[PDB]
Amino acid sequence: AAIAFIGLGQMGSPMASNLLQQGHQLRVFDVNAEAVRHLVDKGATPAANPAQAAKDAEFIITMLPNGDLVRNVLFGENGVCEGLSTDALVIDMSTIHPLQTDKLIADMQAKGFSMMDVPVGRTSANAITGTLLLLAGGTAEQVERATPILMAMGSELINAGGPGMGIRVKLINNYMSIALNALSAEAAVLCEALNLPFDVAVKVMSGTAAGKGHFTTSWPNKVLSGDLSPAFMIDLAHKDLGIALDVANQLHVPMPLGAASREVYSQARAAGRGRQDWSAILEQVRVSAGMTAKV
Amino acid sequence: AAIAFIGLGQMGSPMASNLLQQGHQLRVFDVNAEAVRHLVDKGATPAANPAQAAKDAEFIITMLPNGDLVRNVLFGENGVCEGLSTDALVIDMSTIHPLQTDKLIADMQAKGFSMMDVPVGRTSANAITGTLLLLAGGTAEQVERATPILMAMGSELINAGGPGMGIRVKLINNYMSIALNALSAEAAVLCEALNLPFDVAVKVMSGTAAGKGHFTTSWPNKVLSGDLSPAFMIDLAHKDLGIALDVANQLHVPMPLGAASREVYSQARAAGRGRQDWSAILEQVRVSAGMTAKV
Amino acid sequence: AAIAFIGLGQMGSPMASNLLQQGHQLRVFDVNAEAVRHLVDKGATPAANPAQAAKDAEFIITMLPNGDLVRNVLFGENGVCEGLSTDALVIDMSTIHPLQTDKLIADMQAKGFSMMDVPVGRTSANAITGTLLLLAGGTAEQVERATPILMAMGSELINAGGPGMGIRVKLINNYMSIALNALSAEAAVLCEALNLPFDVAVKVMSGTAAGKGHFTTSWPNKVLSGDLSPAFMIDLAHKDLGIALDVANQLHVPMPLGAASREVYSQARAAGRGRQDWSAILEQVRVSAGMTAK
Amino acid sequence: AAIAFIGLGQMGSPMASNLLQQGHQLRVFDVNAEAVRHLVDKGATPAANPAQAAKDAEFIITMLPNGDLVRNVLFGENGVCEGLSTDALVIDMSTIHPLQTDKLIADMQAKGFSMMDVPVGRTSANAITGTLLLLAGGTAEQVERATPILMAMGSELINAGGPGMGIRVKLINNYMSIALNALSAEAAVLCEALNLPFDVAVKVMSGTAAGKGHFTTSWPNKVLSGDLSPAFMIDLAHKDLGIALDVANQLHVPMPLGAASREVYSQARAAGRGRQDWSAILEQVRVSAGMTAKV
Known part of the structure; x- marks a missing residue:
């Protein structure tokens, strides 16, 4: 699938790396150009900003330090929303405030976009081996659609039971x-x-x-x-x-x-x-x- | 064996009862005369006070609410020390302050008497069935000597590795x-x-x-x-x-x-x-x- | 003086009311239309948004519940910055996070605007009688310039000794x-x-x-x-x-x-x-x- | 007046010293011989134990670190009770558990003895200058009787309004x-x-x-x-x-x-x-x- 991956930190880099191994085409963005270059060396295409990453992507993954940075990447200048198809699915894998997750999902739905929360358990060593615990929020339909992508990054998927239940x-x-x-x-x-x-x-x-x-x-x-x-x-x-x-x-x-x-x-x-x-x-x-x- | 049992509360009564079932001869004492009568009906000998309970006992068990009551039963008027043989072994199974346990063990050793701390895990339901967790303080020699008695009241013994380590x-x-x-x-x-x-x-x-x-x-x-x-x-x-x-x-x-x-x-x-x-x-x-x- | 007042809550309404009593010309804004109407009945000019409140004001006062709302009123859609003169002085009288105050003051200075922190002590009863404690942050120059306006809302001014020292x-x-x-x-x-x-x-x-x-x-x-x-x-x-x-x-x-x-x-x-x-x-x-x- | 003072610590020594300055005859006792020697040099008579301190004393003051030590000095071997007149008044100026104070006052009343609680506010510097805050427990009659003595050690007396109210x-x-x-x-x-x-x-x-x-x-x-x-x-x-x-x-x-x-x-x-x-x-x-x- 065509995937945008925003956030190439200690968790994001190995997660994106596993998606490349499973044959996905990734457009990646991070504020750190060296982190982008490392994924480009593994076969990713670089993007200048989140909007360009999102253009023609089926799945948009965010892995970022906090809810303010997720909101800025989705709704800010050159944000994902400027490049996003209504048929695409945004997957926030960040650990952020659950009431911020609720508000991002609602704000995305108001613009006709689909977003689900799939934060992860276990640490970067597990990110490298694709053995993360996937805490899958979102609707049953979103979890079903995302599961093939998610299983590239984690070895165990838990159905958290609805939008915002993953981050909870x-x-x-x-x-x-x-x-x-x-x-x-x-x-x-x-x-x-x-x-x-x-x-x-x-x-x-x-x-x-x-x-x-x-x-x-x-x-x-x-x-x-x-x-x-x-x-x-x-x-x-x-x-x-x-x-x-x-x-x-x-x-x-x-x-x-x-x-x-x-x-x-x-x-x-x-x-x-x-x-x-x-x-x-x-x-x-x-x-x-x-x-x-x-x- | 000849056993004295002092403290016939919610834990002590069923513990004493299990010792009787395994064929030990018990002399029992408690401030509650009905608790004593209940064990006497099952074949215990009554004692008028701790000193009488201890007389000709090989093992003296205390199971009491706090360290002041243990001290009073061991060292007070008509206390265990007045009836205790130097060949006998005192086992405090009470949950009390560990520095109080240390001082009781030291005060007993100063009078030529042997005392160890074997408090218990799990609750009165386990006390009835003899399935308590035995937390065995005392020297290697004391734990070895007490083990056959203790296994009448508990189903698992942990060697805590020294005097005062059980209460710790x-x-x-x-x-x-x-x-x-x-x-x-x-x-x-x-x-x-x-x-x-x-x-x-x-x-x-x-x-x-x-x-x-x-x-x-x-x-x-x-x-x-x-x-x-x-x-x-x-x-x-x-x-x-x-x-x-x-x-x-x-x-x-x-x-x-x-x-x-x-x-x-x-x-x-x-x-x-x-x-x-x-x-x-x-x-x-x-x-x-x-x-x-x-x- | 020409004053904009944004935030007509339990504190803001009586503070704005005291400025009108002392003869200032106020342009007021709040999201609550009844709070605006109450000030308009006392002689305030209504403004449609913070930008319009700020237009032609010498002093811009904000009195709002939290630092996110102060930032939105200053920098957001129809925000104060769209109507603000470089000769004007913004006074945030809100009780907000002090590191947010520092960032608002810095962001205003980057656009050539002047902002100081003057939160208030004592309660709405004191706001009604103009007997608030003024906890005046800002430069010595800003505190000197603001003092005549501030003394309409409070009876006692403490110079906190710098930008961000009032909210601290x-x-x-x-x-x-x-x-x-x-x-x-x-x-x-x-x-x-x-x-x-x-x-x-x-x-x-x-x-x-x-x-x-x-x-x-x-x-x-x-x-x-x-x-x-x-x-x-x-x-x-x-x-x-x-x-x-x-x-x-x-x-x-x-x-x-x-x-x-x-x-x-x-x-x-x-x-x-x-x-x-x-x-x-x-x-x-x-x-x-x-x-x-x- | 004839006063016994038991407890010559950082607070007790200067309090006893101020009673001597106001012309009272003191019998002092402490286990610390240096503290006793200092008071004897200022005109106190040394006593071998609390009982001897109390003999022929109208007022007995205790100033001790905890309620167990107060109980031992009043009721223990060679305790105040062995030397105490029924016409005398015991004043505990210690900071101890208020329920211990209640029990000491009750135990003294059971033996026909009168005891009140007058702990103090402010520190040893104020103890030296007689400027302590006197927190006077006891009956109205006890506070009235003690006040002349108490004003040698403190500059302000607050009537706490009953037995045990001073320590509270x-x-x-x-x-x-x-x-x-x-x-x-x-x-x-x-x-x-x-x-x-x-x-x-x-x-x-x-x-x-x-x-x-x-x-x-x-x-x-x-x-x-x-x-x-x-x-x-x-x-x-x-x-x-x-x-x-x-x-x-x-x-x-x-x-x-x-x-x-x-x-x-x-x-x-x-x-x-x-x-x-x-x-x-x-x-x-x-x-x-x-x-x-x-x-």
Whole structure:
């Protein structure tokens, strides 16, 4: 197919490279002329701007650092919209604000253009080997049309379930992993301060929610089944957090996420949940967010 | 064997019950006379106080709510120490402050008595079926001697690798799981606010550090190998957290752990780590705790 | 003077109203037709868009909700720049991102136009009576030129000392007051949970840094003089926070700012500051922010 | 008067010294022999233990680091209670847990002894000059009886309004001042990172709640009068916090208290308070603590 590829960064370059290997004709653009030259050496045609990249393209892929740059490439001076056919499909593979993705898709549809969000999981090493995780937003029809192109860049495609759902699931995933890293560090540094070999902690945690997560362990048969009868009471969880923070403060291990988490359990106790299962923290956060209680 | 069991609460009662089933002779004590009566009906001998429970016992188990109650049962009026043989082994299976465990073990050794820490993972349902996770502190010799008794109450034993290491690994495990629950709730409620079905997010997160944890995914070949060359740069992780918090604040989903986590990544960027792998957050927290940089 | 006023919200409407009262000729624009009509009834000339508002104006005031809207009104379709004289002075009185203010001022200077930041302190009640606090950014020349106009809308002018310094001081002020409100609430609710009448706590706190602030009490003769010898050691402050959080957690009073503050003191103790004066927390935060130690 | 003084630390030594200057006869005790020697040189009589210090004393003052040490000095081996007259008055000037103060006062009353809590504000420099703030707990009768003694050590007495109210107001004061210091540092460092001279910020803040506090400015005529009609809406305050956090994160100034504060305003918005006065944050925190809404 005729493809325009805008954004030849650490992810974009290997993604574009895999499309060339699968026999697509690429017109490429990036602000960095050396990055363009590298794709031209692999068989891409250079374009002077996004509009020229888009001219006669069936698929327009953007892979850019943020939503302001995506908007500028699509709607700015010499933007994709100046070169775009109404039969073409724009695929934004960028990680940007989901409400910016919604507004770009709406603004494209107002001009008779089709756009879908397919951000990716895994890092540039996986981009090189075409083993990215494709988080495919867009309509079922758009995902079906894009899939042959997308499978050149990734090895696994997840149906995110609609326009803007790809960037939403990417954002939930990255929010959880990035925050989890800071909490993981607190546990590991407290472990070191207590002179406990980390491998012993990892062995224990690999067998509990500590290492496996709550989503598929503690939650399914309790809060997610509407059952808050306790396996492990909020009062006990709150007590154990207080012990961890007592130790951390005696050993000068700063634990901001632990300190914040205890005040969440304290709010749950103030709301009368002390004898509920620890999975009831999900319902407490829903109520704090103004949502209707499910249990 | 001849066993004393002190503490017949939601965990202790079924633990004591399993020891009776395996043919041990138990002398039991608790402040609740009905809890004692229930074990006496199953063939336990009652004790008037901990000293009487301990008399002629080879193994003395405590399962109590906190370190002050363990100290009072061991060292107080009619305490275990008044009835204890120097050949006997005290096993505290309580979840208490680890520096309190160390001081109890030291105070016992000063009187020529042997004591180890074997707190347990999993909840009272597992206590009933003898499927607790045994977190065995103590010397190699103590863990070897206690193992046949402990396997009556649990189905898996982890050798924590020394006196006080059992209570340490229990505290690290519970700190991590209890705080993780609060973070998991933030991610799940943001997911709901963005109209993304939870199961779709869990399917994606099950394949990344979000669902699998950093301990065995992102950390081993980076920070834990002394390599902070980036797979995923701190600058990008910090930017994505900012987007998550922007969305949460627009949708009034309070995310205190996320908000705290972004200020940790901000401090990492201030310390010059913006171009390092996200696993460098472990080193940042070590430095914040006054530890010497490893990388 | 000939003034354009863009933004007739809860602050903008009474500010524009005070300029009319002091005899200025105003050309007004807002997207809300009722807000424009209210100013027209007081003697303003309506303009169809920002460009037309700016035409023949000596001073162009913007009072808008955020920096994206200020940029759109200045640089967008029918924007101020299409009607602006190089002799005119643009005054943004909005509370927006300070780095956006810097970029707007620079973008205006690149087109030969003059722009200054004069955000305002105090509320719409003060906007009605012309008793706002004027937080005047801009060059000394711009502040001098604007002052006669600004004194129609405010009763007190602070010269913030340069382009972008007005929005900076407004942001520092509001950051501190808005966050302080959340901490004040934690202290007041813990007070109630301990069955202590609030008036007793306020009487005590009015005599200490609790009620008077650290900026002019504990800091000047210690950290701000480069003296970290202790009047009140970080170790003691950290211990007392632990007691407060123990009580709050027993009484189920959630104290997230207190919980966060103890982990800041914990980091100071990790950095070897436990025997330093509590004012050394400022130096700890500077180091955490990557600044050169004092 | 005949006074026993137990605790000759950085605060206790100068407090005892001022009682000597005002012509009282002191029996002093501390485990630190250098501190005792210094007071003996100023005319104090040394005592071997608290019981001997208390013998024939009308007033017994304790100034100790924590509630366990106060309990040990009053009720332990050779404790004050062994030397105490029922006509004497015990004054604990320590900063300890208020529920420990309550239990000490109750335990003393059970033995027919009278005890009040009079902790102090201001630092050791003020202790030297007798210019401490006296935070007088106790009954009206106890405060009246103690006042002549207390005015030797402090220049201002506040009647806290009952037994245990002195330690409560000391804890509220120190909680607020100690946490405020950390918030003050965030504002001052953000100021420096923006290249704004700090003196300009202090001049502005001295005229607003930023420098004067909310307790006597924004609160009295709004939330404390049951009026949540907005002078400054929660929505606007929340927006401005988001701008401050955006700037802090771009300039890598870590602002954990600011980050936490924005999630409190976010919870207020979730509870429907966005168009309420910012003083409604007090009501939000009361509701989060399980208290009945007032307004």
